């Protein structure tokens, strides 16, 4: 499992059978890409990055929420 700090690489990865898993925690939110040998997590604190990334969900990738 790898995690990503900078949204850019994350977006290069979800731009590269693709599905995206978003999960809510009290203080934080996480976005999760499945790829052959790695599970990519992306965490953010503030709601701005949050909504912005929710926007970022493309038609190619389907969004699952737990």
Q: Provide the binding-site residues for RNA, judged by CB under 7 A.
A: 1-3, 16, 21, 23, 25, 28, 30, 32, 35-39, 41, 43, 66
Contacts of 45 (CB under 8 A, 6+ apart): 27, 28
Tell me how far, at minimum, the Cβ of 51 lies from RNA, in Å: 19
Cβ at position 5, least distance to RNA in Å? 8
Sign of CA dihedral 59, 28, 26, 50: negative
Structure tokens at 25: 């925690």
In angstroms, give the least distance from the CB of 63 to RNA: 13
């Amino acid at each position: 499992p790898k995690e990503i700090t900078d949204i850019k690489k994350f977006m290069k990865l979800w731009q590269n059978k693709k599905v995206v898993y978003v999960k809510t925690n009290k203080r934080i939110t996480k976005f999760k890409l499945r790829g052959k040998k790695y599970l990519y997590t992306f965490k953010t604190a503030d709601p701005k990055i949050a909504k912005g990334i929710k926007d970022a969900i493309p038609a190619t990738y389907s969004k699952i929420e737990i």
